[PDB]
């Protein structure tokens, strides 16, 4: 059988083998050289048109010969040497040695779409992240199956980055992976982890036989799984984006199906479901400098006065660099005046996130609609712990014992809950030394506060004053816990 | 067999360069290796590569032991042929 | 029809029959030598792709011919003699010179990627890599190699819950490149876990599917409704097309399921917790027990997953505490790590506490295990138990864990003339069936309950039944270390006052 090289040659020199050639001419020279069976020569010898005798000569030939030498041989003797010379030239520019950009782009675009990838954000890109995503994906196209976890705070912007990381470079799709399948999960029911994989297979399915799509709706899990892998064999280097996984079962299925997965999620621990070592990239809160860039990018006026850069540090403070709630802010700051910007700053407090809830590219009116879920999923006991964090000052690094005061139950158990709490929605901020301390930001703070029982706030505050008796960069010392009064300011506002 | 036939095939150029099956039909049939009809069919072939293909097949079958034929290229002044095939036979 | 040898050949030489061949070329030669019918040639002759005409030629062929002869004769005539030569070579390294087939005519045709194709399609999970149990994965593979010759056989990889059996089968079929390709042609790995009476049939509904071609999964009928005699007959029929096919039955609980495997003359790897399901098979059964992780292996396992190494006397001890409580339990050990996030011996010892005052629920975590904690697993091991045996187990909580103790001392708490051997009979069934107990014939017949097997019972059984069993034993206690507690000193179980006062 002729190898790709040897078959790529019969194909490249095809415009020519049509203008002047004839399989009848070669049949005797092949049968004579024991290259063609009686029936072979019968099949190619009785054909009305020549393109038939040619297509059968090139099909039949690619199977029969151990190599391409005889073809050249015959092409010579037949006064068609201008042919056997072209093919021998081609076999040599491989034996002796080891287009339009815009046009090419269309292919990239189609690859992106059919895989249901959304458009990448353009007016502002956190290159760093999109860059590091792409990098760690390149490192892995070699791998047979793998998880990439693009986790972060709710609405911290994870999904947008996957849009961009598969949309900037032209390698990830075409060079590193052949195709893309991007599916949004968001599964909560127990039928969701199966329903997902019903639609994943559909993505793989040919455009033909979407008509024949059966009542696959009713068929076991062992079968949808076996069905998919069958189809999977058809496609090579198929990347899977699983935008928004909540249930670890998805990861589990992903690992039974030996898939290559990008994964956006809020809860990071779903990765413990996978035994394979999984790589991670955390979508942090927008740094103070990146917030500026993000604002300018969307026509937002930069600071001009001391108490104007401050008006804007207030928004950043409240937003704590929150892509999603920051965006909701802009869509609301129509006046685009440092003034109406500050009106919101004050308003957001006396109304929580609901003060700036707006129609946004986010599926959600306000970040509170999102976080809802992040809180429901929480261990029944952990749902409790989170409720009592409101009392603590936001954006303050504070000790474990000072927390042991409001939280229900050596109280290390408090710390264990507070870790689960940062792991599972970036609700809290851990920090090992100088001393084990956590911290609640304002977005999260405001959310929890406005969400809880108006009573449970005041009850936790009193439950704290009790422990207040005992017997800034500078963390609060144990000689001075008796007075949480430093934050009287940020406490009197209850 | 494979040896004999491989010979009629290897020495194909000369046979299919000069040579004529009409010349051998009277002899081969005299050797009873051919039939009147066989000779007639070949005799009635427009091109020689036709009359030649036929005979080769006939030889490979009817005259598997084409030894007799190996004395025909001798008599036909085509001895440069019957000599080459005896080498192959050798 | 042919057989496993003649069909294993059409399968081994398959990478080749795809690169150069065509069933249209052979149809005329076979309608002729009396192997085909004018519908047969119709069915294989009108097929859009060749892999279709090929898969139908190899399916239809394996049924029709009394042997593999005209085929060889054909690849000869069709200038594809590099084929008929390979197959005649293969048929020869079987009848005359045995053994030589695997080293010579099969070994060269190995390729790592091929395995992964075969593993994935046989629904094998990925093997663990960050730690491999040397001894076991090796011995599994060995005893499987010894049997590829055999026509049907059971291999029982039996062990305690979460003891790690299923992972080893993942590795034993994933390390060596021989088991798949060289010793067995294909793999079918199916998880059982069947409890209902319909489960042993439902299993084998998936087995047949696991067999059926990628084509005609569309045609899959309402096989959901069809007798057992037929699913069984229906399976073996297709099986023909499956030479040297292996079966992993991950997690068998039912001996009835064990059976079907023997009516179907299958070749089976079997992970299970209850070992006695093997009494269902009259066929010789060979066994490999997944023991508790030895003290040294525990270290290796810890280091492998970034776990610090003992530095101080009372730090190697902090770690001997985890190993004691875990008793080398793969699954609960893993749950430990995922929870030991600080990794500091300190937070490692915090947990060592949580384990005594909360049982396994103190370290229950999201893990590669289908189970949050080993208690979710053992639940089942305990439900299945003979109603009378469920009782015996339930009272074992009183006994000190990790202590070798006499039968009579046990006769005191366990329910039921003058010879209480019946206690021993229950305690054997008890180690045989989930390995919930230890056994030791001499010096004297004594059993033992480990800690993982102990904390569970402690936290699950009726808070009352614990205290009632403790009082019960005292009455029997009246009577008239390496060394087994002597009969002069049973009157005082007081040696373990330490491990008794904590109740
Ligand atoms: N250029 C941008 N980069 C990052 N986030 C942006 C950008 N522009 C807007 N956003 C905000 O993020 C929203 C979408 O957030 P995104 O989906 O990226 O977060 P996410 O991590 O997917 O959150 P989820 O937790 O819901 O999966 C946008 O509609 C907008 O509110
Ligand atoms: N070699 C290993 N490497 C890493 N983890 C292991 C290993 N063996 C067992 N485990 C732990 O046990 C879990 C799965 O255990 P496994 O399935 O191997 O035991 P098992 O005997 O099958 O239990 P069951 O009989 O209940 O299936 C894994 O998630 C892991 O936590
Ligand atoms: Mg999203
Ligand atoms: Mg298992």
Author numbering:
A (entry chain B): 1 to 98, 106 to 416, 426 to 487, 521 to 543
B (entry chain C): 3 to 92
C (entry chain A): 1 to 416, 424 to 487, 521 to 543
The authors write:
In Caenorhabditis elegans (C. elegans), onset of programmed cell death is marked with the activation of CED-3, a process that requires assembly of the CED-4 apoptosome. CED-3 is synthesized as an inactive zymogen; its activation requires association with the CED-4 apoptosome. Activated CED-3 forms a holoenzyme with the CED-4 apoptosome to cleave a wide range of substrates, leading to irreversible cell death. Here, we report cryo-EM structures of the CED-4 apoptosome and three distinct CED-4/CED-3 complexes that mimic different activation stages for CED-3.
We thereby assembled the ternary complex of CED-4/CED-3_CARD/CED-3 catalytic domain, hereafter referred to as the holoenzyme, to mimic the full-length CED-4/CED-3 complex (orange). In the presence of the catalytic domain of CED-3, more than half of CED-4, 52.1% existed as octamers. The octameric CED-4 is nearly identical to that in the crystal structure, with the eight CARDs observing a group I stacking. The ring-like density on the top of the CED-4 apoptosome can be assigned with four CED-3 CARDs. Overall, the tower is of ∼120 Å tall and ∼170 Å wide at the bottom. CARD–CARD interaction between CED-3 and CED-4 involves helices H1 and H4 of CED-3. Basic residues on CED-3, including Arg7, Arg63, and Arg64 appeared to contact the acidic residues on CED-4 CARD, including Asp20, Asn78, and Asn79 (cyan rectangle). Compared with WT CED-3 CARD, less R7D co-migrated with CED-4, whereas R63A/R64A no longer associated with CED-4. In contrast, neither CED-3 R7D nor CED-3 R63A/R64A responded to CED-4 apoptosome, supporting an essential role of the CARD–CARD interaction in CED-3 activation (lane 4–6). However, in the structure of the holoenzyme and the CED-4/CED-3_CARD complex, four CED-3 CARDs were resolved.
